[PDB]
Amino acid sequence: EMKERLGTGGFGYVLRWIHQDTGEQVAIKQCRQELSPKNRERWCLEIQIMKKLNHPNVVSAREVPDGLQKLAPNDLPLLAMEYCEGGDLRKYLNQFENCCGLKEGPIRTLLSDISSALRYLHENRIIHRDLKPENIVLQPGPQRLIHKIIDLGYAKELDQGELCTEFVGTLQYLAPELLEQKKYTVTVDYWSFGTLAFECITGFRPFLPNWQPVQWHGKVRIVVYDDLTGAVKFSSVLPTPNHLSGILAGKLERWLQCMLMWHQRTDPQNPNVGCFQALDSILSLKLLSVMNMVSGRVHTYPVTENENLQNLK
Amino acid sequence: LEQKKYTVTVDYWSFGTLAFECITGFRPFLPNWQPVQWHGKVR
C-alpha cells in the first residue's frame, strides 16, 4: 500500500503516497468527479505532457507505482511525480524574516532556475499560464538548492488547445485575465514570473493589498509607481527597503520595469530575449566588491576573467 | 479627494444612495469600497 497527502487544485488532488519501505516519495494527481468528454480527455493530454517532458527545475512523472496501482475509482489514469522535500516556494516567502525581501541569490537561483524551466516550455510551446509561489518547490540539492515547479498544467499547449480554464485556488497573481480575452500570448507567463520575482525580492507586486478586479486600475490611469491614503502604496519604479545587492537595483528597476506588462511583454533598445538573454546577462557578471575602510564602506566592480590587480588598483 | 465640482449636486448624489439604501439595502455598491469604486463609475 501507500502513505499521505499534499495540496489541491486543477482537477483535484496531490498525494505523497509511498511504497512504505525504501520510501518511494511519489506524487499523485487524481481526477475530479467526471467532466465533459473533451474536458476529461484534456486531463489525459496533461498526463502524457508532464511525462512527455523532463527538465531539472520542473518535475517529471514516475509513471505509475505497479504496487497497489488503481485504488482509483475512475477507469481514468492517475499521475505519479517525483515529490520534492519541503519547498513550497510560498512556505519560505512567508518564512518570516523574508518580510522586507528574500535577498539571497536564492533570488539568483530562482530567477535562474525558473527562467530555464519556462525556457523549456516555450520550447514545446506550452505556456504555463498561471504561476504562483505555490507551484514551486525549493528542495535541497546535491550542491545549491534545486527548485522545481510541481502541480501545474493549466497549460494552453499550442496546437492541442488549452487545458481546463479551471481558474481555481489563489488568483491573486495572474495577468490580464479579466476572465479570458484573446491575448493568451506567451507574454502572460512573463508577467506572473515578474511579480513572482518582484515579490521574492521584496514582499509585494504592482500590489496585493486591494485585490484582483480591485486592481484593473492597478493598470494605471502605468510604467510608474503609485498612490496612498494614510500610508499605503502600490508600485513599480523604485523597488523599496529590501536586502539586495547595491548593483541589483541595477537589474530590478530596469528588468522588472519590462517584465511587468501587457499584450506584448520587450526592452525597446533592441530585440533581445524576454527573460533569458537580459536576465541571464543581468544574472551572470562576475562581481568583485572591495570594502574600503576609508569609511566609504564599500565599492563593487564588474570583472571579466581577463583583468588583474593593478586594473582594479 | 477634492475636484472643483463641490456644486450643489453632491448632496443629490448622497441622498440618492442614502435613499436607495433605504429602499433596499445597498447603493451603486458597497461591498468593495471607495477608491475601490471609481470603476464603480462604470467603463
Side-chain angles (χ1 to χ4, degrees), chain A residues 1-63 65-74 76-266 268-313, chain B:
Chain A
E1 274 241 325
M2 302 171 108
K3 272 185 189 148
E4 282 186 24
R5 284 204 177 182
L6 295 195
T8 300
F11 299 129
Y13 293 144
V14 200
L15 311 157
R16 61 155 83 215
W17 303 129
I18 287 203
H19 152 59
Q20 311 128 295
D21 212 12
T22 316
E24 304 295 306
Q25 300 281 11
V26 286
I28 290 86
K29 191 186 193 169
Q30 53 211 15
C31 323
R32 201 166 176 173
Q33 47 158 34
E34 284 182 2
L35 306 150
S36 215
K38 64 169 148 77
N39 251 295
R40 265 168 326 175
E41 166 276 315
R42 259 167 173 163
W43 184 94
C44 212
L45 174 60
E46 195 197 58
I47 299 316
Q48 181 223 321
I49 266 55
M50 308 257 296
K51 152 74 74 178
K52 195 195 85 164
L53 300 184
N54 60 328
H55 174 79
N57 293 338
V58 57
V59 280
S60 39
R62 286 209 210 172
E63 196 178 354
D66 300 327
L68 204 72
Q69 272 283 345
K70 269 186 160 179
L71 294 192
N74 268 110
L76 282 159
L78 258 42
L79 192 67
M81 324 205 86
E82 44 159 26
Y83 152 76
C84 303
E85 272 87 333
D88 178 2
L89 169 52
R90 183 169 286 308
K91 284 184 187 186
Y92 315 121
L93 273 143
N94 325 313
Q95 185 75 287
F96 207 59
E97 34 195 43
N98 308 324
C99 97
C100 279
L102 168 95
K103 154 63 184 198
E104 325 313 332
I107 314 262
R108 267 177 221 74
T109 64
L110 154 70
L111 266 182
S112 176
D113 285 22
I114 302 318
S115 70
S116 203
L118 308 171
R119 167 94 221 116
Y120 186 55
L121 304 164
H122 309 277
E123 287 332 274
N124 304 252
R125 298 174 328 292
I126 313 163
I127 292 86
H128 191 63
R129 277 157 111 201
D130 89 325
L131 196 41
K132 321 213 269 157
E134 304 77 60
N135 32 358
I136 303 181
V137 169
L138 297 175
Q139 188 206 1
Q143 289 134 28
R144 328 154 179 204
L145 283 169
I146 325 169
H147 46 259
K148 290 210 160 185
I149 168 175
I150 203 168
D151 212 350
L152 308 182
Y154 289 52
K156 170 106 184 174
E157 170 189 4
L158 284 197
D159 307 349
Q160 278 173 291
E162 303 171 0
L163 306 180
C164 40
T165 299
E166 308 289 299
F167 261 94
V168 180
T170 294
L171 194 58
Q172 323 199 40
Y173 281 94
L174 206 59
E177 289 328 323
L178 329 181
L179 325 171
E180 322 318 312
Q181 283 86 296
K182 195 65 156 190
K183 234 89 184 193
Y184 282 104
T185 46
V186 195
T187 305
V188 146
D189 286 322
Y190 299 158
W191 163 292
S192 38
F193 186 26
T195 135
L196 162 88
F198 183 116
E199 167 66 81
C200 265
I201 279 89
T202 70
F204 331 106
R205 333 174 201 159
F207 84 114
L208 206 72
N210 269 228
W211 189 273
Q212 163 52 19
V214 190
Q215 282 151 222
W216 317 329
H217 162 65
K219 217 143 95 195
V220 163
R221 282 178 300 199
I222 311 156
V223 203
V224 199
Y225 71 76
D226 278 320
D227 101 347
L228 285 95
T229 41
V232 290
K233 202 158 189 196
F234 311 105
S235 320
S236 202
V237 151
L238 201 43
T240 61
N242 92 302
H243 60 283
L244 219 79
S245 103
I247 208 46
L248 270 188
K251 148 189 51 66
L252 211 163
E253 330 185 27
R254 277 160 306 185
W255 196 47
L256 300 209
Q257 190 99 223
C258 209
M259 282 300 271
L260 257 45
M261 306 267 70
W262 35 260
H263 274 224
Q264 83 311 331
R265 287 270 173 301
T266 44
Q269 294 69 32
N270 50 261
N272 71 333
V273 190
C275 47
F276 311 99
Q277 209 141 205
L279 180 277
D280 295 340
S281 306
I282 282 187
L283 207 158
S284 74
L285 298 167
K286 293 134 170 228
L287 304 185
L288 252 202
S289 17
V290 210
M291 176 49 100
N292 202 338
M293 284 330 293
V294 154
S295 87
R297 301 151 59 240
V298 202
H299 274 76
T300 282
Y301 304 81
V303 176
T304 72
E305 195 138 37
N306 221 262
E307 302 171 326
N308 90 335
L309 198 65
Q310 80 162 327
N311 307 45
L312 210 81
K313 281 195 157 190
Chain B
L1 325 170
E2 321 319 311
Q3 283 86 296
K4 195 66 155 191
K5 234 88 184 194
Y6 282 104
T7 45
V8 195
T9 305
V10 146
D11 286 321
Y12 298 157
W13 162 291
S14 37
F15 186 27
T17 136
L18 163 86
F20 184 116
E21 166 67 82
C22 264
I23 279 90
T24 69
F26 331 106
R27 334 173 200 161
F29 84 114
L30 205 73
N32 269 228
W33 190 272
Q34 163 52 19
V36 190
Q37 281 151 223
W38 317 329
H39 162 65
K41 216 144 95 196
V42 163
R43 282 178 300 199

